[PDB]
From Swiss-Prot, chain C:
Gene from which this protein is expressed: PSMC3
Taxon lineage: Eukaryota, Metazoa, Chordata, Craniata, Vertebrata
Similarity section: Belongs to the AAA ATPase family.
Record localization: Cytoplasm; Nucleus
Signal peptide residue numbers: none
Subunit structure, interactors included: Component of the 19S proteasome regulatory particle complex. The 26S proteasome consists of a 20S core particle (CP) and two 19S regulatory subunits (RP). The regulatory particle is made of a lid composed of 9 subunits, a base containing 6 ATPases including PSMC3 and few additional components. Interacts with PAAF1.
Protein name: 26S proteasome regulatory subunit 6A
Disorder: Deafness, cataract, impaired intellectual development, and polyneuropathy: An autosomal recessive disease characterized by early onset of deafness, cataract, severe developmental delay, and severely impaired intellectual development. Patients later develop polyneuropathy of the lower extremities, associated with depigmentation of the hair in that area.
Description of post-translational modifications: Sumoylated by UBE2I in response to MEKK1-mediated stimuli.
Coiled coil (residue ranges): none
Swiss-Prot record, chain F:
Highest taxon, organism lineage: Eukaryota
Family affiliation: Belongs to the AAA ATPase family.
Organism (species): Homo sapiens
Entry protein name: 26S proteasome regulatory subunit 8
Oligomeric and partner information: Component of the 19S proteasome regulatory particle complex. The 26S proteasome consists of a 20S core particle (CP) and two 19S regulatory subunits (RP). The regulatory particle is made of a lid composed of 9 subunits, a base containing 6 ATPases including PSMC5 and few additional components. Component of a complex with USP49 and RUVBL1. Interacts with PRPF19. Interacts with TRIM5. Interacts with NDC80. Interacts with PAAF1. Interacts, in vitro, with the thyroid hormone receptor (in a thyroid hormone T3-dependent manner) and with retinoid X receptor (RXR). Interacts with ERCC6.
Function: Component of the 26S proteasome, a multiprotein complex involved in the ATP-dependent degradation of ubiquitinated proteins. This complex plays a key role in the maintenance of protein homeostasis by removing misfolded or damaged proteins, which could impair cellular functions, and by removing proteins whose functions are no longer required. Therefore, the proteasome participates in numerous cellular processes, including cell cycle progression, apoptosis, or DNA damage repair.
Subcellular location: Cytoplasm; Nucleus
From Swiss-Prot, chain H:
Protein name: 26S proteasome non-ATPase regulatory subunit 7
Pfam families, alphabetized: JAB, MitMem_reg
Lineage: Eukaryota, Metazoa, Chordata, Craniata, Vertebrata
N6-acetyllysine carried by residues: K200, K210
Species for this entry: Homo sapiens
Function: Component of the 26S proteasome, a multiprotein complex involved in the ATP-dependent degradation of ubiquitinated proteins. This complex plays a key role in the maintenance of protein homeostasis by removing misfolded or damaged proteins, which could impair cellular functions, and by removing proteins whose functions are no longer required. Therefore, the proteasome participates in numerous cellular processes, including cell cycle progression, apoptosis, or DNA damage repair.
Crosslink position(s): Glycyl lysine isopeptide (Lys-Gly) (interchain with G-Cter in ubiquitin): K176
From Swiss-Prot, chain I:
Induction of the gene: Expression is not cell cycle-dependent and occurs throughout the cell cycle.
Family named by the database record: Belongs to the AAA ATPase family.
Function: Component of the 26S proteasome, a multiprotein complex involved in the ATP-dependent degradation of ubiquitinated proteins. This complex plays a key role in the maintenance of protein homeostasis by removing misfolded or damaged proteins, which could impair cellular functions, and by removing proteins whose functions are no longer required. Therefore, the proteasome participates in numerous cellular processes, including cell cycle progression, apoptosis, or DNA damage repair.
Modified residues (N6-acetyllysine): K19
Cell compartment(s), UniProt: Cytoplasm
Protein name, as recorded: 26S proteasome regulatory subunit 7
PTM summary: Monoubiquitinated by RNF181.
Organism from which the protein derives: Homo sapiens (Human)
Superkingdom in the source lineage: Eukaryota
Quaternary context: Component of the 19S proteasome regulatory particle complex. The 26S proteasome consists of a 20S core particle (CP) and two 19S regulatory subunits (RP). The regulatory particle is made of a lid composed of 9 subunits, a base containing 6 ATPases including PSMC2 and few additional components. Interacts with NDC80/HEC; this interaction is detected only during M phase. Interacts and SQSTM1. Interacts with PAAF1. Directly interacts with TRIM5. (Microbial infection) Interacts with HIV-1 Tat.
Length: 101, 94, 53, 50, 209, 50, 287, 286, 48, 50
């Protein structure tokens, strides 16, 4: 509210579904919107849903989540400088998160 | 007076005609440049004043006569060496 | 005379379509039921505030 | 000194029902046209698994 | 009349051309082209275009009504459109990194050096190296070094993250891999930086899925 | 140049595929995105086109 | 007493009214009248064209407004010249020229009222480059089904001006209507005033475009002309008996030896002479 | 405040025919009609017109007839068939203009506030004159002068849109003043570009002949506005001298060694290619 | 031939789908009565 | 006030309607490559000052 701009709200559990190349596609779009409107605040509640940690085999579902994670993990510190954009991550759990996160 | 053949006026001619001293002619000519009745410039290694002048006035019909003769000399130089160009390159003009 | 002039140029048959969104810089983007998306800068014989997507 | 065909086989999946298969039929008739022929597969750990 | 002819030939092409793709060439000055309206055609082609740019495939320019070949587009002029030029570009320089003395030199041998001093490799006959893998614990200057190479390079640079070319439809992913390497081969000496690839890197023995 | 510029100013030809079609000076062509047509031949070619 | 190979004279002022009014309403098949004089049996002239207000029906007999007819004719009687209508026209954007089924009914209406009442079809969006797709036609009877339709006679100017085009003979050519030839009542004092007033430049004829971009362009050509000269070195010192009449024909590419040569030498010559010759004249003329 | 007017070439064209319409009864030597327009910006646009009955008497030159009712209805027609177009003014010909044009203009300024008039020149069509357009302002005259009207000038041009160049380029077909010119084309532009230089100058010759000789009353405005022209022409100097041969030589070098040599060697290549192909067909006839 | 979605009162303003081409708001021609143009009916439709 | 609404519609009646498309790339200083929403690709230009 204090000197506001286009604040976002992400529940971080509606962004997973069946098809494999969509959870990365939402994350790419939400950052392209943030580069559109130059002051911007990203808010993502409950990171622990897709935050996690990487491990050996989770064959069916877990490989989608880790690829979803690496898209998030490396578009907020990617090759492009994330400029004038701030991110608030909030989760009640975190004991297991990715150390890269 | 002189029709820009030698418009580089010397500072002493101003000090003679305006009968002002030597040190005041620079403030005098920067004034007339400031008002905008002249657009010249000032050199001081020779202390001579260059003049490019754009404030015209009435020119008293006996000097329309001399203005006519300038226009006719200007007229015949245009016409003559146009004919030299047309006669020289008549074969490729077509 | 203008109302008679508008009467002649407002003539059946009509294409139907669906207004996708509405802009102002009063402006509308329209997909026809020919599956073709058009733009118009000027809307016409309605009001923009009376319209909805 | 012969007609030689390079197929890195992953290029027959394209997007559609159908189309990814029918070009295989359209491949060997194109090899039948240049009737002495050798067709090459790259990396059958793709299509052809099990 | 010869100048009238060259003018009228010239001003048949400056027009809102439609774009189809070249399909097959029958003979001299006539060929088959298929439009991007669908509905494959068969038209005459010009005498202007050098015919060695119509190999089986090229995006081509077509008149609306007469529908003839008009011009050949430059190769892969779009495809995936990935050219990082001049905002966006690096916001970093080479000396900004502190202390990677061995490792700044080692990347420089494989990427920066053979572009400029290519004759040094030819003098020894080396075939200078082609690919490079960087690995370490996170936050140790990996992405930062890749930004610094993209500063002081004079090449066509293409960034890839290792996740956006696995996606929705069947066979869609590997076509994007085809789109990248054709775009680099069509362009100059070029650099492709694919960020973290352990998404698509794990060796599979068999997948019952 | 005049011979080019006049043949340029010409609506281009269609292409339709016939694997086989009937005889008696008329054949049966489906073109590209459309149905089938019973057409006529020109007189510089044969009925032996099949 | 039957038709011939006739002739249609349209004025220069008519043709500009035609394809401007067609270009104005490019989607919606504009409509207008054609006002001239039947001068003899087998020539006809038209001097003037005015348009029509457009109805919701389109090109038909109903778009002809009789109260707009007689009022427009009345105010041309006292100003300019009064004359008889000689036909009509309409615009067909999506295709070149042929009378449609609604076009053929309104032709029946005028040929019953008038003598022949020549129609005109104009495609504005096809008529772009240097040619105009305009054509004129005339409806033929079915009573001459046992006789020669297009009843033409003792002249040899029928095989000119068009062969009947395939896109137009697929419609009612040549068994519902026939084509008719068009040439232009073209005269002096209108030819020269349209020549000299559309393309002219008086004081531009001795300007300079001075030297910061002119002498820069003198670098812009020489540089690749150097490299193209090195390419000219390559083919000439090659000179091998590779059956050299075949070696010259298998590498036509609108390329080096003469094509991509002296063409540049011409442009370097014309630019620098006209520059320097105009420079010496301005020193001559102006003091 | 008008920058320039844009003459669409149907309007002049539709004046010349109307002069030819009345020419069978021609005793008026002037044609006055209504100039439709399309005002867009400080630059003006004209694309349509029509005529109107008008007469004028040589005696007393102030009894004249614009027809209002004919101007009402026929403009109501052209509005109905095309609501894009409106009036912007009027036209006449006969370049020695009658002084009645104050009265013609001040009448029909109640149709358009910033009314404008264009003079076409049907018979004088030879040297340098496409048209001419005036604008109407009224000061008193000057500081210590009586009242006056004083038509002022706005520069003019001939415009071009698509689907009239189509009508233009199809109607020339003879010489056309072909596209971007050769050596002969540019030199003729320097010839008749200069043949109008003294032509404008022979007019300003005759003006300060007949005003300074002593016939007509002198303007004062045009005199000193002519004076600064003569004190603005350049002269020759050493700075003009060493500079001119600095860049004439630089233009010359491109012509001399790069154009004359290479064109000769190409023609020298056509020597050997001819003489080989000549005698090798000669010695191999039998 | 087409189908009819619905109608209006005192004036036709009928809504009709080709459904292979677009859906149209059209009129009836003068040869019929507005009674038996009820909804969901095959009707004969002009080409222009 | 009612005549104001009529003259707005006389302005409103004369508009043409436009085609929605997206720019694929830029070729030269005036040549673009755009693509319609459902149709083909094209080569276009600007108006004056876009
Ligand atoms: N040697 C160094 N000098 C200056 N800054 C450094 C150095 N090493 C790391 N940093 C800082 O660490 C941050 C992370 O850099 P970088 O993203 O390259 O690390 P990383 O190993 O690529 O992380 P990840 O592998 O998770 O992407 C940079 O923003 C940079 O400011
Ligand atoms: Mg990183
Ligand atoms: Zn028609």
């Amino acid at each position: 509210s204090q000197l506001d701009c286009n604040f976002l709200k992400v529940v971080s559990s509606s962004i997973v579904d069946k098809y494999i190349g969509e959870s990365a596609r939402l994350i790419r779009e939400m950052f392209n919107y943030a580069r559109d409107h130059q002051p911007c605040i990203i808010f993502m509640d409950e990171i622990d849903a897709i935050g996690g940690r990487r491990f050996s085999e989770g064959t069916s579902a877990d490989r989608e989540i880790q690829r979803t994670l690496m898209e998030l993990l490396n578009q907020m510190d990617g090759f492009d400088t994330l400029h004038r954009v701030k991110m608030i991550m909030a989760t009640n759990r975190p004991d297991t998160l990715d150390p890269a996160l | 007076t002189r029709p820009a053949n030698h418009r580089q006026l010397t500072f002493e001619e101003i000090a003679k005609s305006a009968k002002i001293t030597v040190n005041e002619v620079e403030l005098l000519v920067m004034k007339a440049l400031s008002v905008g009745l002249v657009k010249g410039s000032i050199d001081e290694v020779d202390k001579r004043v260059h003049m490019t002048w754009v404030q015209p006035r009435v020119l008293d019909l006996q000097q329309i006569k001399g203005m006519k003769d300038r226009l006719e000399f200007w007229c015949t130089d245009v016409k003559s060496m146009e004919m030299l160009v047309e006669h020289q390159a008549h074969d490729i003009l077509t | 005379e203008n109302s008679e002039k508008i009467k002649v140029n407002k003539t059946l048959p009509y294409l139907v379509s669906n207004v996708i969104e509405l802009l102002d810089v009063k402006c509308a983007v329209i997909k026809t039921s020919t599956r073709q998306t058009y733009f118009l800068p000027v809307i016409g014989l309605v009001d923009a505030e009376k319209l909805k997507p | 000194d012969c007609t030689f065909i390079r197929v890195s086989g992953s290029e027959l999946v394209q997007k559609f029902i159908g189309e990814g298969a029918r070009m295989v039929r359209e491949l060997f008739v194109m090899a039948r046209e240049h009737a002495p022929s050798i067709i090459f597969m790259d990396e059958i750990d793709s299509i052809g698994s099990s | 009349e010869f100048l009238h002819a060259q003018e009228e030939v010239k001003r048949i092409q400056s027009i809102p051309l439609v774009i189809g793709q070249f399909l097959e060439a029958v003979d001299q000055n006539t060929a088959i082209v298929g439009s991007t309206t669908g509905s494959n055609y068969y038209v005459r082609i010009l005498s202007t275009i050098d015919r060695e740019l119509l190999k089986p495939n090229a995006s081509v320019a077509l008149h609306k009504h007469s529908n003839a070949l008009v011009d050949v587009l430059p190769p892969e002029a779009d495809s995936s459109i990935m050219m990082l030029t001049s905002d966006q570009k690096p916001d970093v320089m080479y000396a900004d990194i502190g202390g990677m003395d061995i490792q700044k030199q080692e990347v420089r041998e494989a990427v920066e050096l053979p572009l400029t001093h290519f004759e040094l490799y030819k003098q020894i006959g080396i075939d200078p190296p082609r690919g490079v893998l960087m690995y370490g614990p996170p936050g140790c200057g990996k992405t930062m070094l890749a930004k610094a190479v993209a500063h002081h390079t004079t090449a066509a640079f293409i960034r890839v993250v290792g996740s956006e070319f696995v996606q929705k439809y069947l066979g869609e992913g590997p076509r994007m891999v085809r789109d990248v390497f054709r775009l680099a081969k069509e362009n100059a000496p070029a650099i492709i930086f694919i960020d973290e690839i352990d998404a698509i890197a794990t060796k599979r023995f068999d997948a019952q899925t | 140049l005049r011979e080019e510029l006049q043949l340029l100013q010409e609506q281009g030809s269609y292409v339709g595929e016939v694997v086989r079609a009937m005889d008696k000076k008329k054949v049966l062509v489906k073109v590209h995105p459309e149905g089938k047509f019973v057409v006529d031949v020109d007189k510089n070619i044969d009925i032996n086109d099949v | 007493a039957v038709d011939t190979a006739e002739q249609v004279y349209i004025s220069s002022l008519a043709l500009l009214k035609m394809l401007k009014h067609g270009r104005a309403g490019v989607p919606m098949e504009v409509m207008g009248l054609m006002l001239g004089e039947f001068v003899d049996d087998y020539t006809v002239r038209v001097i003037d064209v005015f348009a029509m207000p457009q109805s919701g029906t389109g090109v038909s007999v109903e778009a002809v407004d009789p109260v707009f007819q007689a009022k427009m004719l009345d105010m041309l009687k006292q100003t300019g010249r009064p004359e008889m209508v000689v036909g009509w026209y309409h615009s067909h954007p999506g295709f070149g020229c042929w009378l449609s089924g609604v076009d053929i009914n309104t032709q029946q209406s005028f040929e019953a009222l008038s003598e022949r009442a020549v129609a005109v079809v104009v495609d504005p969006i096809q008529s772009v480059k240097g040619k105009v797709v305009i054509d004129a036609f005339r409806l033929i009877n079915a009573n001459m089904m046992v006789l020669g339709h297009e009843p033409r006679q003792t002249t040899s100017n029928l095989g000119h001006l068009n062969k009947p085009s395939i896109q137009a003979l697929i419609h009612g050519l040549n068994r519902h209507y026939y084509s008719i030839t068009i040439n232009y009542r073209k005269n002096e004092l209108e030819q020269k005033m349209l020549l000299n007033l559309h393309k002219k430049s008086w004081m531009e004829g001795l300007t300079l475009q001075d030297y910061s971009e002119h002498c820069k362009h003198n670098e812009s050509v020489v540089k690749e002309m150097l490299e193209l000269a090195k390419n000219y070195n390559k083919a000439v010192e090659e000179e091998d008996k590779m059956t050299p009449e075949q070696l010259a024909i298998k590498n036509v590419g609108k390329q080096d030896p003469k094509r991509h040569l002296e063409e540049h030498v011409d442009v370097l010559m014309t630019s620098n002479i006209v520059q320097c010759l105009a420079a010496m004249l301005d020193t001559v003329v102006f003091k | 405040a008008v920058q320039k007017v844009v003459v669409h070439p149907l309007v002049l064209l539709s004046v010349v025919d109307h002069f030819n319409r009345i020419g069978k009864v021609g005793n008026q030597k002037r044609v006055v009609g209504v100039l439709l327009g399309s005002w867009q910006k400080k630059v003006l646009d004209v694309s349509n017109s029509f005529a109107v009955p008008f007469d004028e008497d040589d005696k007393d030159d102030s009894v004249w007839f614009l027809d209002h009712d004919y101007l009402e209805n026929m403009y109501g027609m052209f509005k109905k068939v095309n609501a894009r177009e409106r009036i912007v003014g009027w036209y006449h010909t006969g370049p020695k203009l009658h002084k009645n044009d104050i009265a013609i203009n001040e009448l029909m300024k109640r149709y358009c506030p910033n009314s404008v008039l264009v003079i076409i020149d049907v018979k004088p069509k030879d040297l340098g004159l496409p048209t001419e357009a005036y604008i109407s302002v009224e000061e008193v005259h000057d500081d210590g002068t009586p009242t006056s009207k004083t038509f002022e000038h706005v520069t003019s041009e001939i415009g071009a849109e698509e689907a009239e160049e189509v009508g233009v380029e199809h109607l020339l077909r003879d010489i056309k003043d072909t596209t971007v010119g050769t050596l002969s084309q540019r030199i003729t532009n320097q010839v008749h570009g200069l043949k109008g230089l003294n032509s404008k100058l022979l007019d300003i010759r005759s003006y300060l002949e007949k005003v300074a000789t002593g016939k007509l009353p002198i303007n004062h405005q045009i005199i000193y506005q002519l004076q600064d022209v003569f004190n603005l022409l350049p002269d020759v100097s050493l700075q003009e001298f060493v500079k001119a041969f600095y860049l004439k030589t630089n233009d010359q070098m491109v012509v001399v060694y790069l154009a004359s040599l290479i064109r000769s060697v190409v023609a020298l290549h056509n020597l050997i290619n001819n003489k080989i192909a000549n005698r090798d067909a000669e010695k191999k006839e039998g | 031939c087409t189908k009819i979605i619905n109608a209006d009162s005192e004036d036709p303003k009928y809504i009709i789908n080709v459904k292979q081409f677009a859906k149209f708001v059209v009129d009836l021609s003068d040869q019929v009565a507005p009674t038996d143009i009820e909804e969901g009916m095959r009707v004969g439709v002009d080409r222009n | 006030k009612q005549y104001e609404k009529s003259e707005n519609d006389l302005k409103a009646l004369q508009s043409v309607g436009q085609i929605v498309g997206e720019v694929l790339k830029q070729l030269t200083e005036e040549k673009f490559i755009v693509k319609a929403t459902n149709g083909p690709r094209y080569v276009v230009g600007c108006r004056r000052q876009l």
